[PDB]
Structure 1
Amino acid sequence: SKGEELFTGVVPILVELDGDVNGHKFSVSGEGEGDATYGKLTLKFICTTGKLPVPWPTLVTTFLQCFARYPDHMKRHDFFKSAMPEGYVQERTIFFKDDGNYKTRAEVKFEGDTLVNRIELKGIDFKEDGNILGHKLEYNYNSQNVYIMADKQKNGIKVNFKIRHNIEDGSVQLADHYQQNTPIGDGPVLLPDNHYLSYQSALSKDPNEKRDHMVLLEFVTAAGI
């Protein structure tokens, strides 16, 4: 990785998302730091447009794989850091089971010493009586492993994963993710063998914060090779 080195220590992070869900327009600013040496992420997101039209947890996967910890033996698989500083593109479609789907485009990259994640979010065909438009998911998240594969034609990566949000009534709400990554430069990247990223995330609330917002603590480690 010619970007391996950019992550060697504590990185400032910055996240900006602009959203639209069923005409339900919004904005979130996030900021924290990442210490890729420990596959560790620390962040705080604020709804700058007042309250969130959806559920925080629904935005978690959208809200930084370059911060992942690839064990040494797997370094030759780090696409993420391979893209930097240049950066990469992340696009997604999130089909919420029995509900609407989100579409996402992001540009992840460096701005000086800050790692920036800029996102455009558009969700459609959501139900006002939904779990989503209805806000019935619990404020939590479960651990999970994602199946990473190389997308050569595209000089990038292709990923597919399921996410299960809990419904307050004790049920489960599926969010089928589908995803592509492509480098932002015409620069050389690291095409990986299939492996995975194992995640763990913990959401919280800021006792002092008075605004709509999310505290998230995640851990991500490469595995499978």
Structure 2
Amino acid sequence: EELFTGVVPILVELDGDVNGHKFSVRGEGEGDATIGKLTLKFICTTGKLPVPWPTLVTTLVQCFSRYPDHMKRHDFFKSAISNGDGFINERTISFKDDGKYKTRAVVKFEGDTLVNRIELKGTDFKEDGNILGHKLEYNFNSHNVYITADKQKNGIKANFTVRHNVEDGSVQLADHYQQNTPIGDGPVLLPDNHYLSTQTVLSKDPNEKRDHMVLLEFVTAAGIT
């Protein structure tokens, strides 16, 4: 196809509930799948965010990952978007010794804009833990997202552990269980085992007074040759 040949505008909408605390996040930016780069700004439209921004990074469009040419057949994300009318991204994020997030999102184009609509539910968090107690540093480490084809439902699955730096020098782990499935019936390509290498830098908009997160991200596919 040709849907990701240049810079594409992106829109992210997230509605969540963590331990009863409801909230909403709006994301605006653009992506360039050719170099595997994302640049988006996120705002909490309901006031202050009840959880640390970094815990939402993975939830807040892997179709923008850079897949080297020889791995083009393994780019399930792009394939599903152009042959299956987008895809669904479901995850269970388990924070060690704390609560967990369960997320469902639909990723598809709306006009010339790639949209990621998410519903998030957080349960069993310690009101004084690293999440609700905002004890995580404002940064984000580099991770590898291991992808494999689903064994029974024409889709993929991924597993990886995100490492959140705690302000006391410790690290808060977040195990991710990911599942993707195209929204449409059409034939989408299934990949062989491989992973996505990711780098992310978080920052602030000096002129933004609402709770927010400016984000820069580089993702590259690897594991085959």
CA distance in 2, matches of 1:145, 1:159: 10
Answering whether residue 184 of structure 2 is matched by residue 191 of structure 1, we say no
Matching residue of 1:36: 33
Task: State whether residues 152 and 191 of structure 1, in contact with CA within 8 Å, keep that contact through their aligned partners in structure 2.
Answer: no
One-letter amino acid of the structure 2 residue matched with residue 19 of structure 1: G
CA distance in 2, matches of 1:219, 1:49: 29
Q: Quick one: percent identity of the two aligned structures?
A: 89
Matching residue of 1:215: 214
TM-score in terms of structure 2 length:
0.97
SS in 1 for 2:9: strand
Q: CA deviation at 1:152?
A: 4.1
- CA RMSD of superposed structures (Å): 0.7
- The answer for unaligned runs of 5 or more in structure 2 is none
> How many correspondences in the alignment?
222
CA distance in 2, matches of 1:188, 1:31: 31
CA distance in 1, matches of 2:28, 2:15: 15
SS in 1 for 2:73: helix
One-letter amino acid of the structure 2 residue matched with residue 60 of structure 1: V
After TM superposition, the structure 1 = structure 2 runs for residues 1-225 of structure 1, keeping only pairs within 5 Å, are 4-85=1-82, 86-225=85-224
CA distance in 1, matches of 2:153, 2:31: 28
Q: CA deviation at 1:144?
A: 1.2
- The answer for unaligned runs of 5 or more in structure 1 is none
One-letter amino acid of the structure 2 residue matched with residue 217 of structure 1: L
Q: CA deviation at 1:65?
A: 0.7
CA distance in 1, matches of 2:26, 2:186: 29
CA distance in 2, matches of 1:152, 1:7: 28
Runs of 4 or more consecutive aligned structure 1 residues displaced over 2 Å after TM superposition: none
One-letter amino acid of the structure 1 residue matched with residue 24 of structure 2: S
One-letter amino acid of the structure 1 residue matched with residue 25 of structure 2: V
Deviations along 1:152-207, one digit per CA (max 9) or x if unpaired, are 42110011110110100111001110010000000111100111100000111000
One-letter amino acid of the structure 2 residue matched with residue 14 of structure 1: L
One-letter amino acid of the structure 1 residue matched with residue 30 of structure 2: E
CA distance in 1, matches of 2:19, 2:143: 28
